Ligand binder design. Structure first.
Ligand SMILES: Nc1ncnc2c1ncn2[C@@H]1O[C@H](COP(=O)(O)O)[C@@H](O)[C@H]1O
Ligand SMILES: NC(=O)c1ccc[n+]([C@@H]2O[C@H](COP(=O)(O)O)[C@@H](O)[C@H]2O)c1
Length: 321
């Protein structure tokens, strides 16, 4: 057993050094100067001569020069199951989904209506305002660790912004989609072809590939974006509705969309569906549908979910053309 203050100091310093190493080497974007970094590494090196057991092969000092950052896609459990969505392709089906809902919950349900993004699903975990894990869908219970790749996404903050209205939760699991803008997708393809590589067939594939990189510096230099859509497990945050959840997410610095609307009944839902059927092409990223979700979280709890999907939401899918 090492003395506690020595251990405290070392974790903090090593944590800080490593973050800076990652910012400079992987992301190519430091947030402190070179001078300051140098000082930091020296201290941590001293402390490790003063206390040799602290120096291990995983330390940022001994054995990490510009390296140690790699993604291995190992399994990691999601705190809450990350399911898929049921789909509706015709007006009858949607009405049918709403009939089933009205009958169960009775005019008390309002519907958040969002754009369905055609990209890769990503799940982030923030513990005390700090991002700890990012993962793929996988089987629903377990996905893959692409933590470093997510840390390079500009949209995803490392730490959550504190505030008066919305206190940072102890644990927050957030789902959202990663994607490329069409222009960026084209641009990346040109770049790839310029180095002799094969281009990607669509933005969905391109973003998935850009995210799933063993060397995350590859990912850092690609312009992935993310828009958050969902909550998984949370502690210290109990929003009454999903629309109110997005206010908090936004206050904390997470990225949310500007095209979400709150309809009051199925008629309102139908208007949005019709509207995005006509305007979806004006958005800069791929939209294949609209997600319809009962907004109040108590109603969501009552309706629950099946093994594969929730019953409180349905995604209307457009014909592709
Ligand atoms: N706004 C959104 N809300 C929820 N899930 C979404 C949204 N946009 C995309 N998705 C993803 O779309 C996946 C499947 O939808 P689908 O297109 O029906 O297969 C969902 O499970 C989510 O991962
Ligand atoms: N500002 C930073 O965050 C930061 C982080 C890591 C390394 N660096 C710079 O990296 C260089 C390391 O040297 P070599 O990789 O060329 O040995 C140093 O000059 C160091 O200051 C800067």
């Amino acid at each position: 057993q090492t003395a506690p203050e020595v251990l405290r100091q070392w974790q903090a310093l090593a944590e800080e050094v490593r973050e800076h190493q990652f910012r400079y080497y992987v992301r190519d974007a430091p947030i402190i100067s070179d001078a300051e970094f140098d000082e930091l590494l020296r201290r941590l090196e001293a402390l490790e001569e003063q206390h040799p057991e602290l120096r291990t092969p995983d330390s940022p000092t001994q054995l990490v020069g510009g390296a140690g950052f790699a993604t291995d896609f190992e399994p990691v459990d999601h705190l809450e199951r990350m399911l898929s969505l049921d789909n509706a392709f015709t007006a009858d089906e949607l009405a049918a989904w709403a009939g089933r809902i009205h009958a169960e919950v009775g005019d008390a349900a309002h519907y958040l209506c969002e754009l369905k993004i055609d990209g890769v699903a990503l799940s982030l975990v923030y513990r005390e305002g700090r991002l700890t894990r990012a993962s793929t869908r996988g089987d629903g219970r377990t996905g893959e660790d692409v933590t470093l790749n997510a840390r390079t996404i500009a949209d995803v903050p490392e730490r959550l912004t504190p505030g008066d209205d919305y206190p940072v939760p102890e644990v927050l699991e957030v789902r959202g989609e990663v994607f490329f803008r069409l222009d960026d997708f084209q641009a990346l393809n040109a770049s790839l072809v310029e180095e002799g590589k094969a281009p990607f067939a669509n933005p969905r594939n391109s973003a998935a590939g850009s995210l799933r990189q063993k060397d995350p510096a590859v990912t850092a230099r690609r312009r992935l974006r993310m828009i958050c859509y969902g909550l998984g497990h949370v502690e210290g945050f109990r929003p009454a509705t999903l629309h109110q959840a997005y206010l908090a997410l936004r206050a904390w610095g997470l990225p949310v969309s500007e095209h979400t609307t709150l309809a009051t009944d199925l008629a309102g839902v139908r208007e949005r569906i019709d509207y995005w059927g006509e305007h979806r092409h004006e958005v800069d990223h791929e939209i294949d549908g609209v997600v319809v979700k009962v907004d109040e979280v108590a109603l969501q709890r009552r309706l629950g979910s099946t093994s594969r999907a929730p019953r409180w939401a349905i995604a209307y899918k457009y014909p592709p053309e």
